[PDB]
Amino acid sequence: DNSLIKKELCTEGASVEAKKVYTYLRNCWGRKTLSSTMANVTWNVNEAIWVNRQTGKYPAIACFDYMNLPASPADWIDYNKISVVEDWWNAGGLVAACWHWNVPVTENSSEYKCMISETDFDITKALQEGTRENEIIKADLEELAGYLLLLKQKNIPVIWRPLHEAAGKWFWWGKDAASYKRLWKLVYETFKQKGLNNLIWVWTSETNDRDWYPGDAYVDIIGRDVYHKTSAAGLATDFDALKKAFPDKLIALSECGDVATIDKQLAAGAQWAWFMTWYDYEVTKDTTAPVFNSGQHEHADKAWWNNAFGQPGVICRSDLPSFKL
Ligand SMILES: OC[C@H]1O[C@H](OC[C@H]2O[C@@H](O[C@H]3[C@H](O)[C@H](O)[C@H](O[C@H]4[C@H](O)[C@H](O)[C@H](O)O[C@@H]4CO)O[C@@H]3CO)[C@@H](O)[C@@H](O)[C@@H]2O[C@@H]2O[C@H](CO)[C@@H](O)[C@H](O)[C@@H]2O)[C@H](O)[C@@H](O)[C@H]1O
Ligand SMILES: [Ca+2]
Numbered sequence: 502d503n504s505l506i507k508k509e510l511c512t513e514g515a516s517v518e519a520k521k522v523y524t525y526l527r528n529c530w531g532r533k534t535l536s537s538t539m540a541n542v543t544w545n546v547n548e549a550i551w552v553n554r555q556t557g558k559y560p561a562i563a564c565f566d567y568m569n570l571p572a573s574p575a576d577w578i579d580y581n582k583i584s585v586v587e588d589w590w591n592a593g594g595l596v597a598a599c600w601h602w603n604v605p606v607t608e609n610s611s612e613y614k615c616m617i618s619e620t621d622f623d624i625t626k627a628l629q630e631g632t633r634e635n636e637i638i639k640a641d642l643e644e645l646a647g648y649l650l651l652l653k654q655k656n657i658p659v660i661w662r663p664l665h666e667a668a669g670k671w672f673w674w675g676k677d678a679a680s681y682k683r684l685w686k687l688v689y690e691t692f693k694q695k696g697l698n699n700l701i702w703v704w705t706s707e708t709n710d711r712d713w714y715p716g717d718a719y720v721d722i723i724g725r726d727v728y729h730k731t732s733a734a735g736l737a738t739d740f741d742a743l744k745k746a747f748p749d750k751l752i753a754l755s756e757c758g759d760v761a762t763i764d765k766q767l768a769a770g771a772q773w774a775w776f777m778t779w780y781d782y783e784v785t786k787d788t789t790a791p792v793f794n795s796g797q798h799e800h801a802d803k804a805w806w807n808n809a810f811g812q813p814g815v816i817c818r819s820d821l822p823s824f825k826l
């Protein structure tokens with residue numbers, strides 16, 4: 502029974518494809534779990550290709566990262582070149598994106614980071630009109646809205662997960678809950694101003710952090726990021742806690758590495774809407790290097806993925822229905 506899960510996206514006039522994707526996810530709730538991989542760093546499906554070469558199947562969802570706004574467009578990274586994203590969608594896969602929001606390490610720096618230990622960027626100043634920090638984030642949102650509009654123009658919906666792990670307090674946007682929620686609302690309202698109706702909004706919870714929750718008007722799905730947790734009972738306890746906290750929303754395992762196998766998690770009752778393994782930089786950065794074939798992987802290796810795909814409840818790319826017209 503999925504009747505508790507809200508039926509409509511929080512976005513007024515959401516795109517036809519985004520509604521189809523959301524409806525399918527809602528229909529899968531409690532029955533199936535989608536598989537997902539992260540890009541190697543930002544803008545490729547190298548980890549999806551790796552999983553196929555390890556297992557014979559592709560993950561359902563491929564995720565991309567808009568982290569490289571400061572350098573793009575550039576010869577080595579150009580978010581205007583959306584062919585990698587179109588190709589994956591046109592091969593029948595679902596598209597996701599997150600955003601490590603990189604900001605100057607200090608005033609006038611040419612180096613950009615997101616962790617609080619590596620940048621003194623102040624969110625309080627970023628929300629004050631016209632400060633250096635405010636003009637920076639407004640210019641980033643303006644550039645990113647342009648990139649996402651290229652996908653909306655192509656009728657590609659995006660499972661969109663910005664500003665993640667806020668209550669872990671290790672990113673610059675996790676200074677305090679009140680400014681965090683103002684920043685989320687600013688992103689949401691900016692993207693609405695630019696007509697981005699193709700986004701399904703995923704808010705990443707640290708559990709027990711309702712004061713950081715941006716609110717029902719700005720969130721569609723709840724995400725949870727978990728590393729180094731090999732007790733399946735522990736993961737199911739987290740799953741059930743999030744379910745009690747947000748009874749009307751899908752709950753996903755939006756990042757994971759070094760976690761119990763999916764069969765153990767499902768047996769324990771953790772029925773995530775999807776799981777996405779993080780990328781292993783050295784293994785998948787080059788699909789033609791010998792390391793690409795080893796099967797070893799810092800977050801989920803060949804055995805883990807072969808176990809996941811051997812489960813009835815797990816959806817691979819070929820199991821998905823069509824989300825086009
Ligand atoms: O332009 C400004 C930027 O320059 C630097 O990054 C560019 C550089 O990125 C390399 O990947 C890094 C990435 O920068 C992150 O630091 C990433 O952090 C991840 C953590 O490792 C961990 O996994 C965490 O959970 O998640 C984080 C988010 O992904 O790590 C990776 C790996 O170290 C890599 O892509 C480089 O290739 C790239 O540099 C370019 O390289 C090409 C050729 O390969 C050159 O032609 C270009 O001129 C670049 O040098 C800086 O780190 C950024 O923060 C930012 O300042
Ligand atoms: Ca740029």
Ligand SMILES: [Cl-]
Nearest residue numbers: 558559818819
């Ligand atoms: Cl497949």
